C-alpha cells in the first residue's frame, strides 16, 4: 500500500541520528492543592444524609459548579498560546 | 435502511407528549475570576521584550503550568459523580 | 525557588492598572434545542422493555450515533479559527 | 520492577485464546452533513472583506456560537450512558 | 434580532454555488490494534478474583497507566500542526 | 445568596479534621516513548521540501493518522472503568 510505504520511509528519516524528531518525552502535571472527588463528595453527603438520593448530590454539585462556588480541575498538561484561560494561585 | 426506521420511530416516541425525553436545555458556565489568555500573555511578554521569541513565551508558560504557579481554566459545564477533581474558591 | 519568584513578579505586572491582562471573564453556552440525555434514554427503553439489558441500549445508541441518526451535543464554548467543523440550525 | 512484572503477566492472561479481552477494534464516525471549517470561514470573510482583521472573524463566529446560530460539531465516536446530550437530525 | 439576521445572511452566502464553504464531510478513525476496554478488564479481574473489589481494579489500572505499561487510546480524528505528540506503530 | 451559604458550610464540613475529603493530590503522566510533535514534523518536511506548502503537511499527517500508521498520544492521566480503549507496549 502506497500510504504505508511513505510512513515506513518517513519513520526512518526522523530516526536518522542527523534529524532526531523522535525522542522519549517526560510529562509533568502540577500537583493540585486541597481538592475533592465528585464521587467521594456525593458518597459522603449520603453517609451524612443531607441527600435523600444520588441525583440530589449531582444536582447540588452541578448548582455549585455553574455559580463558580466550585471549579473543575483541568487535566491539560500543555501550555497553549491560544485564547485559552489561566489563573495564578495568588487569588 | 433498517437502522434509520428504528431512529425515526424512536424519535416520535420520545416526542410523545406522554414521554417528553426531548426538551430545550439551558446551559450555564460560571463566570471566571481574574484570569488571562495564553496568546495575550505571550503577546504582552514580546511588547515588553522579556521574551526574545514566541517559543520562549510558551516554554515559560509551560514551566509555570507544570508547577501549579498557574492552572488552566476548565470549560466543563457538567458536574460529574466520578473520580474527577474540584476546588472551592476559599483557597 | 527561581520559577516561583518569576511567577509572583509576572502576576503583579499583569495586575498593574496599566497592563490589565487579568479580568473576570463571563462565559456563555448557547441553550440547546430539543435534545435528550443518554442515561434517561437507555433508562426509558427499559421502562418500556424494547431493551432486555443496559448494554443493549448503549449498543443501540452507539449504532444510531455512528450513522449520524443522532449526533452528540458538544460542550465547547469557544469559537476556534481552526480546521474544526460547525453547522447552522437551518438544516 | 514489581509493577512491570504484573503488567507483562496480565498481558499474557488476556492474550490467552481462552480469555480474549484484546482484539482489533474498528471505529466509525458518522459522516457529517452540510458543514464548514472555522479557518476557511474566517479566511473567506477576509477575501470578501466583511472583516477588517482576523480577531473580528473569531469574535463574530464566537458571537454566532454562543447564541446557537451555529453549533460546533463534536468528534466523540462513543455513545455514553450518562447525563450527556444528543439530537436527531429531524429538527 | 440583529445577530440572527447576520447568520441567516452568511448562511446563504456560503450556500452560494459560487462559494461552497458548506459540504458533507466524511470522517475516518484508524481501526485500533489489539486493545481492551477498562470495564471489561476490571470486570474480568473480579470473575478471576485477583481483585477483592472494584476500586482495587481501577487503582491497579491507574498504576499501570501512569507508568506507561498501558497507554490510553485517543479518539482524536484530526491531525493537528501543533506541539501535540504522535507515534508510529514500528515500536 | 442561598447557594453561596450552602457552599461555605459544605467547605468547612469537608475541611473538618474528622472528614478529610479535601487534600493535595499528586498527578503522574507516564513518560512517553520515541514520539514527535506535529508542528516540528510539518516544519521539518518544509526544511527538506517534500511539502510545497503547510496544508500539504497537515493533509499528509492526517492521511497517516486515519490509517493508524501514526496514532495521537492521549494526555488522559486517569484510568477509567468504562468502555474506553487501552494498549500495552508489548505490540
From Swiss-Prot, chains A, B, C, D, E, F:
Tissue: Mainly expressed in peripheral blood leukocytes and brain. Expressed at intermediate level in spleen and lymph nodes, and weakly expressed in other tissues.
Cellular localization per UniProt: Cytoplasm, Cytosol; Cell membrane
Domain DEP intervals: 15-90
Domain of life of the native organism: Eukaryota
Record's subunit section: Interacts preferentially with RAC2. Interacts with RAC1. Interacts with AUTS2.
Described function: Functions as a RAC guanine nucleotide exchange factor (GEF), which activates the Rac proteins by exchanging bound GDP for free GTP. Its activity is synergistically activated by phosphatidylinositol 3,4,5-trisphosphate and the beta gamma subunits of heterotrimeric G protein. May function downstream of heterotrimeric G proteins in neutrophils.
UniProt protein name: Phosphatidylinositol 3,4,5-trisphosphate-dependent Rac exchanger 1 protein
Source organism phylogeny: Eukaryota, Metazoa, Chordata, Craniata, Vertebrata
Complete-protein stretch covered: 409 to 497 of 1659
Amino acid at each position: 500500500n502506497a500510504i504505508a510505504e511513505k510512513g515506513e520511509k518517513l519513520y526512518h528519516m526522523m530516526m536518522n541520528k542527523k534529524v532526531n524528531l523522535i525522542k522519549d518525552r517526560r510529562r509533568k502535571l502540577s500537583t493540585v492543592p486541597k481538592c475533592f472527588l465528585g464521587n467521594e463528595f456525593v458518597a459522603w453527603l449520603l453517609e451524612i444524609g443531607e441527600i435523600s438520593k444520588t441525583e440530589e448530590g449531582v444536582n447540588l454539585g452541578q448548582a455549585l459548579l455553574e455559580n463558580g462556588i466550585i471549579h473543575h480541575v483541568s487535566d491539560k498538561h500543555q501550555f497553549k498560546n491560544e485564547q485559552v484561560m489561566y489563573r495564578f494561585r495568588y487569588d
